[PDB]
Design an enzyme around this catalytic site. Structure first.
Site, PDB file in Angstrom:
ATOM      1  N   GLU A 253      38.953  56.265  37.686  1.00  0.00           N
ATOM      2  CA  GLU A 253      39.382  55.010  38.296  1.00  0.00           C
ATOM      3  C   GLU A 253      38.274  54.415  39.156  1.00  0.00           C
TER       4      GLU A 253
ATOM      5  N   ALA B 244      35.938  64.429  36.609  1.00  0.00           N
ATOM      6  CA  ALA B 244      36.535  63.736  35.466  1.00  0.00           C
ATOM      7  C   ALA B 244      38.048  63.590  35.589  1.00  0.00           C
TER       8      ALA B 244
ATOM      9  N   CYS C  63      46.302  55.245  46.629  1.00  0.00           N
ATOM     10  CA  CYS C  63      46.866  54.284  45.675  1.00  0.00           C
ATOM     11  C   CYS C  63      46.614  52.832  46.085  1.00  0.00           C
TER      12      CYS C  63
ATOM     13  N   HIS D  73      59.630  38.833  22.883  1.00  0.00           N
ATOM     14  CA  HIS D  73      58.412  38.250  22.277  1.00  0.00           C
ATOM     15  C   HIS D  73      57.952  37.003  23.033  1.00  0.00           C
TER      16      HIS D  73
ATOM     17  N   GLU E  46      56.887  45.169  23.467  1.00  0.00           N
ATOM     18  CA  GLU E  46      57.810  45.097  22.335  1.00  0.00           C
ATOM     19  C   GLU E  46      57.342  45.930  21.155  1.00  0.00           C
TER      20      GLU E  46
ATOM     21  N   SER F 259      53.135  59.790  53.050  1.00  0.00           N
ATOM     22  CA  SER F 259      54.184  59.273  52.171  1.00  0.00           C
ATOM     23  C   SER F 259      55.518  60.005  52.365  1.00  0.00           C
TER      24      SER F 259
ATOM     25  N   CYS G 192      47.866  57.852  50.465  1.00  0.00           N
ATOM     26  CA  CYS G 192      48.073  56.722  49.567  1.00  0.00           C
ATOM     27  C   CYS G 192      47.751  55.402  50.265  1.00  0.00           C
TER      28      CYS G 192
ATOM     29  N   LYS H 284      42.728  51.743  46.123  1.00  0.00           N
ATOM     30  CA  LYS H 284      42.159  51.911  44.786  1.00  0.00           C
ATOM     31  C   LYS H 284      42.716  50.867  43.812  1.00  0.00           C
TER      32      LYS H 284
ATOM     33  N   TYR I  65      41.595  61.632  37.279  1.00  0.00           N
ATOM     34  CA  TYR I  65      41.939  60.214  37.345  1.00  0.00           C
ATOM     35  C   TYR I  65      41.270  59.532  38.540  1.00  0.00           C
TER      36      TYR I  65
HETATM   37  C1  FAD Z   1      42.135  58.451  45.525  1.00  0.00           C
HETATM   38  C2  FAD Z   1      43.609  58.724  45.339  1.00  0.00           C
HETATM   39  C3  FAD Z   1      44.382  57.830  44.606  1.00  0.00           C
HETATM   40  C4  FAD Z   1      45.750  58.053  44.417  1.00  0.00           C
HETATM   41  N1  FAD Z   1      46.464  57.138  43.666  1.00  0.00           N
HETATM   42  C5  FAD Z   1      47.753  57.345  43.493  1.00  0.00           C
HETATM   43  C6  FAD Z   1      48.509  56.367  42.724  1.00  0.00           C
HETATM   44  O1  FAD Z   1      48.063  55.341  42.202  1.00  0.00           O
HETATM   45  N2  FAD Z   1      49.862  56.681  42.592  1.00  0.00           N
HETATM   46  C7  FAD Z   1      50.505  57.787  43.133  1.00  0.00           C
HETATM   47  O2  FAD Z   1      51.730  57.911  42.946  1.00  0.00           O
HETATM   48  N3  FAD Z   1      49.793  58.687  43.870  1.00  0.00           N
HETATM   49  C8  FAD Z   1      48.472  58.468  44.032  1.00  0.00           C
HETATM   50  N4  FAD Z   1      47.741  59.375  44.774  1.00  0.00           N
HETATM   51  C9  FAD Z   1      48.446  60.543  45.333  1.00  0.00           C
HETATM   52  C10 FAD Z   1      49.132  60.248  46.658  1.00  0.00           C
HETATM   53  O3  FAD Z   1      48.163  59.765  47.587  1.00  0.00           O
HETATM   54  C11 FAD Z   1      49.718  61.546  47.214  1.00  0.00           C
HETATM   55  O4  FAD Z   1      50.550  62.158  46.230  1.00  0.00           O
HETATM   56  C12 FAD Z   1      50.543  61.340  48.484  1.00  0.00           C
HETATM   57  O5  FAD Z   1      49.766  60.662  49.476  1.00  0.00           O
HETATM   58  C13 FAD Z   1      51.040  62.666  49.017  1.00  0.00           C
HETATM   59  O6  FAD Z   1      51.884  62.425  50.158  1.00  0.00           O
HETATM   60  P1  FAD Z   1      52.121  63.547  51.237  1.00  0.00           P
HETATM   61  O7  FAD Z   1      53.186  63.006  52.196  1.00  0.00           O
HETATM   62  O8  FAD Z   1      52.334  64.826  50.509  1.00  0.00           O
HETATM   63  O9  FAD Z   1      50.729  63.632  52.034  1.00  0.00           O
HETATM   64  P2  FAD Z   1      49.704  62.619  52.707  1.00  0.00           P
HETATM   65  O10 FAD Z   1      49.999  61.239  52.284  1.00  0.00           O
HETATM   66  O11 FAD Z   1      48.307  63.144  52.409  1.00  0.00           O
HETATM   67  O12 FAD Z   1      50.046  62.739  54.289  1.00  0.00           O
HETATM   68  C14 FAD Z   1      49.738  63.930  55.047  1.00  0.00           C
HETATM   69  C15 FAD Z   1      49.350  63.469  56.437  1.00  0.00           C
HETATM   70  O13 FAD Z   1      49.452  64.567  57.386  1.00  0.00           O
HETATM   71  C16 FAD Z   1      48.260  64.611  58.156  1.00  0.00           C
HETATM   72  N5  FAD Z   1      48.070  65.972  58.672  1.00  0.00           N
HETATM   73  C17 FAD Z   1      47.449  67.023  58.052  1.00  0.00           C
HETATM   74  N6  FAD Z   1      47.451  68.136  58.755  1.00  0.00           N
HETATM   75  C18 FAD Z   1      48.114  67.788  59.919  1.00  0.00           C
HETATM   76  C19 FAD Z   1      48.444  68.513  61.086  1.00  0.00           C
HETATM   77  N7  FAD Z   1      48.142  69.806  61.264  1.00  0.00           N
HETATM   78  N8  FAD Z   1      49.111  67.862  62.068  1.00  0.00           N
HETATM   79  C20 FAD Z   1      49.420  66.574  61.891  1.00  0.00           C
HETATM   80  N9  FAD Z   1      49.159  65.789  60.841  1.00  0.00           N
HETATM   81  C21 FAD Z   1      48.498  66.455  59.891  1.00  0.00           C
HETATM   82  C22 FAD Z   1      47.180  64.114  57.202  1.00  0.00           C
HETATM   83  O14 FAD Z   1      45.983  63.748  57.877  1.00  0.00           O
HETATM   84  C23 FAD Z   1      47.922  62.934  56.559  1.00  0.00           C
HETATM   85  O15 FAD Z   1      47.894  61.748  57.350  1.00  0.00           O
HETATM   86  C24 FAD Z   1      46.354  59.185  44.993  1.00  0.00           C
HETATM   87  C25 FAD Z   1      45.582  60.072  45.739  1.00  0.00           C
HETATM   88  C26 FAD Z   1      44.215  59.853  45.917  1.00  0.00           C
HETATM   89  C27 FAD Z   1      43.407  60.832  46.724  1.00  0.00           C
HETATM   90  C1  FAD Z   2      58.961  25.619  22.025  1.00  0.00           C
HETATM   91  C2  FAD Z   2      59.634  26.896  21.583  1.00  0.00           C
HETATM   92  C3  FAD Z   2      59.287  28.098  22.191  1.00  0.00           C
HETATM   93  C4  FAD Z   2      59.892  29.299  21.803  1.00  0.00           C
HETATM   94  N1  FAD Z   2      59.518  30.459  22.454  1.00  0.00           N
HETATM   95  C5  FAD Z   2      60.082  31.590  22.085  1.00  0.00           C
HETATM   96  C6  FAD Z   2      59.668  32.815  22.754  1.00  0.00           C
HETATM   97  O1  FAD Z   2      58.828  32.912  23.652  1.00  0.00           O
HETATM   98  N2  FAD Z   2      60.329  33.955  22.297  1.00  0.00           N
HETATM   99  C7  FAD Z   2      61.284  34.002  21.289  1.00  0.00           C
HETATM  100  O2  FAD Z   2      61.763  35.108  20.977  1.00  0.00           O
HETATM  101  N3  FAD Z   2      61.650  32.853  20.653  1.00  0.00           N
HETATM  102  C8  FAD Z   2      61.071  31.700  21.046  1.00  0.00           C
HETATM  103  N4  FAD Z   2      61.436  30.529  20.411  1.00  0.00           N
HETATM  104  C9  FAD Z   2      62.455  30.606  19.348  1.00  0.00           C
HETATM  105  C10 FAD Z   2      61.875  30.977  17.992  1.00  0.00           C
HETATM  106  O3  FAD Z   2      60.866  30.032  17.642  1.00  0.00           O
HETATM  107  C11 FAD Z   2      62.983  30.902  16.941  1.00  0.00           C
HETATM  108  O4  FAD Z   2      64.095  31.693  17.356  1.00  0.00           O
HETATM  109  C12 FAD Z   2      62.537  31.382  15.560  1.00  0.00           C
HETATM  110  O5  FAD Z   2      61.377  30.661  15.135  1.00  0.00           O
HETATM  111  C13 FAD Z   2      63.656  31.222  14.554  1.00  0.00           C
HETATM  112  O6  FAD Z   2      63.231  31.766  13.291  1.00  0.00           O
HETATM  113  P1  FAD Z   2      63.904  31.300  11.945  1.00  0.00           P
HETATM  114  O7  FAD Z   2      63.330  32.195  10.843  1.00  0.00           O
HETATM  115  O8  FAD Z   2      65.371  31.234  12.182  1.00  0.00           O
HETATM  116  O9  FAD Z   2      63.350  29.810  11.718  1.00  0.00           O
HETATM  117  P2  FAD Z   2      61.943  29.068  11.756  1.00  0.00           P
HETATM  118  O10 FAD Z   2      60.929  29.929  12.389  1.00  0.00           O
HETATM  119  O11 FAD Z   2      62.182  27.707  12.393  1.00  0.00           O
HETATM  120  O12 FAD Z   2      61.559  28.917  10.187  1.00  0.00           O
HETATM  121  C14 FAD Z   2      62.278  28.022   9.308  1.00  0.00           C
HETATM  122  C15 FAD Z   2      61.262  27.471   8.329  1.00  0.00           C
HETATM  123  O13 FAD Z   2      61.928  26.927   7.155  1.00  0.00           O
HETATM  124  C16 FAD Z   2      61.395  25.638   6.890  1.00  0.00           C
HETATM  125  N5  FAD Z   2      62.384  24.854   6.141  1.00  0.00           N
HETATM  126  C17 FAD Z   2      63.402  24.089   6.644  1.00  0.00           C
HETATM  127  N6  FAD Z   2      64.146  23.515   5.722  1.00  0.00           N
HETATM  128  C18 FAD Z   2      63.573  23.927   4.533  1.00  0.00           C
HETATM  129  C19 FAD Z   2      63.880  23.662   3.179  1.00  0.00           C
HETATM  130  N7  FAD Z   2      64.903  22.890   2.790  1.00  0.00           N
HETATM  131  N8  FAD Z   2      63.100  24.232   2.230  1.00  0.00           N
HETATM  132  C20 FAD Z   2      62.083  25.009   2.614  1.00  0.00           C
HETATM  133  N9  FAD Z   2      61.696  25.326   3.854  1.00  0.00           N
HETATM  134  C21 FAD Z   2      62.479  24.748   4.768  1.00  0.00           C
HETATM  135  C22 FAD Z   2      61.032  25.093   8.266  1.00  0.00           C
HETATM  136  O14 FAD Z   2      60.164  23.968   8.195  1.00  0.00           O
HETATM  137  C23 FAD Z   2      60.387  26.343   8.881  1.00  0.00           C
HETATM  138  O15 FAD Z   2      59.026  26.527   8.496  1.00  0.00           O
HETATM  139  C24 FAD Z   2      60.846  29.292  20.771  1.00  0.00           C
HETATM  140  C25 FAD Z   2      61.183  28.091  20.152  1.00  0.00           C
HETATM  141  C26 FAD Z   2      60.586  26.893  20.549  1.00  0.00           C
HETATM  142  C27 FAD Z   2      60.975  25.610  19.864  1.00  0.00           C
HETATM  143  N1  GVY Z   3      31.961  69.748  38.280  1.00  0.00           N
HETATM  144  C1  GVY Z   3      33.331  69.776  38.412  1.00  0.00           C
HETATM  145  N2  GVY Z   3      34.212  68.867  37.843  1.00  0.00           N
HETATM  146  N3  GVY Z   3      35.479  69.113  38.153  1.00  0.00           N
HETATM  147  C2  GVY Z   3      35.689  70.177  38.954  1.00  0.00           C
HETATM  148  C3  GVY Z   3      36.966  70.598  39.534  1.00  0.00           C
HETATM  149  C4  GVY Z   3      38.144  69.847  39.355  1.00  0.00           C
HETATM  150  C5  GVY Z   3      39.349  70.237  39.963  1.00  0.00           C
HETATM  151  C6  GVY Z   3      39.379  71.396  40.754  1.00  0.00           C
HETATM  152  O1  GVY Z   3      40.494  71.816  41.425  1.00  0.00           O
HETATM  153  C7  GVY Z   3      38.218  72.184  40.928  1.00  0.00           C
HETATM  154  C8  GVY Z   3      37.015  71.779  40.320  1.00  0.00           C
HETATM  155  S1  GVY Z   3      34.164  71.003  39.378  1.00  0.00           S
END
Ligand code: FAD
Ligand code: FAD
Ligand code: GVY
Ligand code: GVY
Ligand code: GVY
Ligand code: GVY
Ligand code: GVY
Ligand code: GVY
Lengths: 586, 586
Positions: A295, A289, A154, A564, A569, A112, A149, A157, A291
């Site tokens: 995982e 134990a 990463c 929403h 949110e 990396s 990685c 996995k 990550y």
């Molecule tokens: C199972 C697992 C899951 C992970 N998941 C994540 C994740 O989801 N998100 C995240 O951010 N990080 C994750 N990581 C961590 C991430 O992989 C490491 O932080 C990252 O790869 C480190 O980068 P690096 O460049 O330090 O080393 P590396 O990526 O390990 O690269 C070092 C390289 O140098 C080579 N090398 C070693 N010695 C020599 C030498 N003498 N001459 C030439 N080449 C050599 C090695 O073989 C290797 O290819 C995970 C790690 C593991 C083990």
């Molecule tokens: C299809 C659709 C999808 C939407 N999706 C999203 C979304 O994903 N995210 C988002 O943030 N917003 C979304 N909206 C917008 C959101 O629904 C509205 O912004 C929100 O409902 C407005 O709230 P309000 O309190 O102003 O009115 P309303 O929720 O419309 O409430 C007004 C209420 O007062 C009642 N009323 C009316 N006149 C009277 C009266 N004279 N006496 C008594 N009661 C009365 C009405 O019948 C109603 O029950 C969507 C809207 C639609 C139509």
């Molecule tokens: N039985 C065990 N579970 N975790 C261990 C551990 C973890 C990180 C280390 O750097 C060294 C040992 S041993």
């Protein structure tokens, strides 16, 4: 200040042009360099508030104060008239390729961080080599370019996590009206592995294409730093030679640890082997134990496996422990077994059947902390008990690079080691979060400081994370317990709530997803830490990390309006405090 | 300043106690009020930097300067000794229920805003009534308490969107190793509708329980404001009566429009009817191009429908038009047909078969802007051509509430109308974003200013949105074209990139998902607008809305580290500018 920056920039840039955007003489030098295919950094003085001073200080190196000025590896090459003179006489190619060293940059490690640093340096005309070698696992597993990685981390996995998630998508589909019957659907491990490995192979090839197209030399060889500027390489034929470089970046990463017990190396596997395993693991014990452990256990169970996790003490040491317990409780309610407060003391009952593609059979013996015995049979045993570097293989101790007590490199805040031309990035940099995007940012930013005159440092604070357990856990900042230890309980306010995804209503749990904000009362309710357990937790968490980087307060979350309907949110309307004792349920 | 706030707070609070946290005499009055089940607001003077001045100014109302001081509807009731005197003589209940009006608050409309305002006001001892009535659609459709979002909006539309999304989850499952055959699975509309309506029914009931438990009076009756403090109600038996209230909140929302053409009201339907329709619409024409039109067409196609959208001019008028075109292109490539630059001029061929649960059949005639003819048969025609209030039904024009030229209420920044005791919230508030979380925040914040002495206003700027089309579109801030119109093209920089979700690799498109940041060069690269097209776009967008509220710059996105592997992390490493002409593809 300005003069010190300019000295460092001139000394280490490979090819750099000082210029202004309004100068046709600068445009005329650019066009000649581009046509000769000469890559270089450029600094436009009219775009820097400090440019008047820089233009004056350039005269300390060149005896002139005008633009353009071209430098190669610390040496003033000439102004306009002089560069075109070299071009017309076909003397320019030899001038810009002149070096005391074979390479401007040698990167040891093609993962990396190292690939990111090498490609970025080549952009500015640094002649760059990237070395990568993958030492095989005890059972022989190896893989291609790209690092941990890409090949065994990463990427595979999360793809197997998605396969696990689709099991519950299939169950949900019946409730939303689709005609399938989930109880009659099964999973084929080898089909999923073939698809995962086909994607990994496209990444291996993509990196090789990328290096070739950036004129980076890729050597599939093991590298060893034997002096500050000398790297000894060993190739696939055991041929040993030496190459030299001005700057060195160490980027060699870590590999899995094994416990020191009989049968572990012989009969167990690690994550390095899991992601290309030709057979389904079957009944599986995961020891650990972290990550990685949780995982892997999680997706194995979702794919129909009988899975047990052996936990020595706690889950997810170093993460918020309220959140860690909720993660594990969800796993235990959804088909993962746990052997708590237990460690192993491995016997082989059946050898792996490679021809008919079946696991072996193993007898595991261990004990609980009170002394009671553990004994059970498994088809596969996966160790996830930490990772470590082996820098003794990478670095001769006479070079003078300082290491800490865990064997990681001690660096300044610009990634410099105790040897002035040698830098370290990624997992081997002591004290830094061990994550792929951190390694990439460190390497890219470093290449720009070395070869383009940049100043920006990598910021390692409040780096967000996500654990891709069956129910995902995202976080950014302090755990609740770390905040209370740092500031005291009287200064900490915690806002929290359960929630239910709208997608879970028609699909039939009410109060398992959870979120909280950990805040500092005496600093305007500053958000010290954000935590969420629920679907798509990494997508939820990412945008908040920008707000936390900028110092977000509870008031900032309150004044922002929600989108929403979403899970995220719920962060915009939190109001129940832990001190109040009011329930967080929906 | 302090004195003006205190006068407004005393005049409008129903029951309020001025107190300090350290006073046992205040604690002794609290305990008596709680035991008598007397709800009230409380202001703790020792927690306000202005409390010394407030304590002095209280003497203008009560002739005393000490705490506690209890007020009821603008009248000083007494200090400690006096309140306990009323309690001991069983005179207190009658004192705190004394009012010139039947209610402290009457809310007209029981939807998103009105329910939020009513529950919040009751918390502080305001005697509150909520009125709700649902006028049936032309074909007779009606529903329960909760408003448009709950019954015929955000909630059922996102649940049917999820049903549509699960179609592609089923296709993807084969590539990840599951044994199903997607081509042999079908969808049952009536099963999905029953499940959606069961959830809506639980929400109807939940709101009724919530109002009962907060001592709010719920009247299922149509309300009409006939003078500033008088509301005429009409119940389910056509009985007409009058109730009076101190403060009035108008929260009546909008309903769908129909085009003025023959057959539209008789033979078409709207979104009000779609979400409880007993039969699958069949071959469907959607007339319109709003987010309602495209969301509905999108999930109908994913559920196996033959769907056409008739577009008068453009898609998603008012949204970023580059993004709108990408949304529509994805829909057209994934099974939605479009009749562009076309409007309708509806004839009935078959009556709906309610006994055997089948749609009818219709002949639609229209024309394109060049004059050419449109003519085609459909089973269902859905109109999504805008929404409007009908305040002439709600509000006698002699009351004096000012309306704009679209019939919405003209309000100050604290939601006050031109009649001092009457407020408006939600969709009928002129100029405000018409969204459910905006309506909820407006109503909650308003109730606190009226009855608890709060000062905080609702902030209506940079409110984030998400369109739940088959590929989702999230946004926060300005469109690119609005930013260029406001500041000029020379001051606008746009960073952009395509991306591919990791989940899409094993599932087999490379360059359809897209994101951009629209930035202002002369204000430190301030992020004016953020836009993303891809899966889970609402979860992606939400957290960035906090950062934009705080004034995020491009540098803030750059210094924040990504979470890997996610879609959202692509925002943290954007670098390609539109001005550069470099391709955004992966
Ligand atoms: C199972 C697992 C899951 C992970 N998941 C994540 C994740 O989801 N998100 C995240 O951010 N990080 C994750 N990581 C961590 C991430 O992989 C490491 O932080 C990252 O790869 C480190 O980068 P690096 O460049 O330090 O080393 P590396 O990526 O390990 O690269 C070092 C390289 O140098 C080579 N090398 C070693 N010695 C020599 C030498 N003498 N001459 C030439 N080449 C050599 C090695 O073989 C290797 O290819 C995970 C790690 C593991 C083990
Ligand atoms: C299809 C659709 C999808 C939407 N999706 C999203 C979304 O994903 N995210 C988002 O943030 N917003 C979304 N909206 C917008 C959101 O629904 C509205 O912004 C929100 O409902 C407005 O709230 P309000 O309190 O102003 O009115 P309303 O929720 O419309 O409430 C007004 C209420 O007062 C009642 N009323 C009316 N006149 C009277 C009266 N004279 N006496 C008594 N009661 C009365 C009405 O019948 C109603 O029950 C969507 C809207 C639609 C139509
Ligand atoms: N039985 C065990 N579970 N975790 C261990 C551990 C973890 C990180 C280390 O750097 C060294 C040992 S041993
Ligand atoms: N990007 C995605 N990750 N998981 C998905 C999923 C998981 C569980 C479900 O119930 C349905 C879908 S989609
Ligand atoms: N393809 C390869 N590159 N290097 C290899 C190597 C290096 C050192 C060793 O000790 C053994 C093997 S194999
Ligand atoms: N919360 C969720 N919304 N959609 C989901 C989904 C959609 C498409 C897919 O391919 C797989 C899962 S999960
Ligand atoms: N349940 C109901 N509440 N009000 C109703 C009503 C009101 C005014 C009318 O003109 C017609 C019906 S029905
Ligand atoms: N054929 C049509 N498509 N859209 C229309 C529309 C949209 C919003 C409005 O407020 C009014 C009309 S008419």
């Amino acid at each position: 200040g300005t003069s010190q920056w300019l000295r460092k920039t001139v000394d280490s840039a490979a090819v750099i042009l000082f210029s202004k955007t309004t100068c046709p003489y600068c445009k005329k030098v650019k066009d000649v360099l581009a046509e000769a295919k000469i890559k270089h950094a450029t600094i436009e003085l009219d775009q820097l508030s400090n440019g008047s001073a820089i233009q004056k200080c350039l005269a300390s190196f060149s005896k002139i104060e005008t633009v353009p000025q071209m430098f190669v590896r610390g040496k003033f090459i000439g102004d306009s008239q002089t560069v075109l003179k070299y071009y017309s006489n076909d003397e320019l190619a030899g001038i810009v390729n002149e070096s005391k060293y074979d390479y401007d940059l040698i990167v040891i490690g093609g993962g990396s961080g190292g690939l990111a640093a090498g490609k970025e340096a080549a952009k500015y005309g640094a002649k760059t080599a990237v070395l990568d070698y993958v030492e095989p696992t005890p059972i022989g597993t190896t893989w291609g370019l790209g690092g941990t990685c890409v090949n065994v981390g990463c990427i595979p996995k999360k793809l197997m996590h998605q396969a696990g998630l689709l099991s519950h998508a299939l169950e949900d589909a019946e409730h939303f009206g689709w005609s399938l019957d989930r109880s009659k659907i099964s999973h084929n491990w080898s089909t999923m592995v073939e698809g995962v490995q086909s994607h990994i192979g496209s990444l291996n090839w993509g990196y090789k294409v990328a290096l070739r197209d950036n004129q980076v030399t890729y050597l599939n060889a093991k590298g060893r730093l034997i002096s500050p500027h000398e790297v000894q390489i060993t190739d696939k034929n055991q041929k040993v030679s030496t190459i030299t470089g001005n700057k060195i970046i160490l980027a060699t990463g870590e590999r899995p640890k094994y416990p020191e017990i009989p049968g572990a190396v012989e009969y167990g596997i690690t994550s390095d082997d899991l992601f290309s395993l030709p057979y389904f693991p079957g009944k599986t014990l995961v020891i650990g134990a972290s990550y990685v452990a949780l995982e892997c256990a999680g997706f194995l169970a979702s794919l129909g496996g009988d899975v047990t996790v052996m936990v020595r003490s706690i889950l997810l040491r170093g993460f918020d422990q309220q959140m860690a317990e909720k993660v594990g409780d969800y796993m235990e309610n959804h088909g993962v077994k746990f052997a708590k407060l237990c460690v192993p003391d491995i016997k082989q009952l059946k050898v792996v059947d490679t021809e008919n593609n079946k696991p072996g059979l193993l007898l595991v013996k261990g004990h609980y902390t009170d002394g009671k015995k553990f004994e059970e049979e498994f088809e596969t045993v996966i160790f996830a008990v930490g990772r470590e570097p082996q820098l003794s293989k990478v670095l001769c101790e006479t070079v003078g690079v300082k290491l800490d007590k865990n064997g990681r490199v001690v660096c300044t805040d610009d990634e410099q080691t105790t040897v002035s031309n040698v830098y370290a990035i990624g997992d081997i940099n002591a004290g830094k979060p061990q994550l792929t995007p951190v390694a990439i940012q460190a390497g890219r930013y470093l290449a720009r400081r070395l070869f383009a005159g940049a100043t920006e440092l990598t910021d390692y604070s409040n780096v967000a994370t996500t654990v891709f357990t069956p129910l995902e856990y995202g976080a950014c900042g302090l755990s609740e317990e770390d905040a209370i230890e740092k500031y005291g309980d009287k200064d900490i306010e915690v806002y929290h709530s359960n929630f239910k995804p709208l997608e879970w209503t028609v699909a039939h749990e009410d109060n398992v997803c959870y979120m909280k904000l950990v805040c500092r009362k005496s600093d305007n309710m500053r958000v010290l830490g954000l935590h969420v357990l629920g679907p798509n937790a990494g997508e939820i968490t990412q945008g908040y990390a920008v707000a936390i980087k900028m110092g977000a307060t509870k008031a900032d979350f309150d004044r922002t309006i929600g989108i929403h309907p979403t899970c995220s949110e719920t962060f915009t309307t939190l109001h129940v405090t832990k001190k109040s004792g009011v329930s967080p349920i929906v």
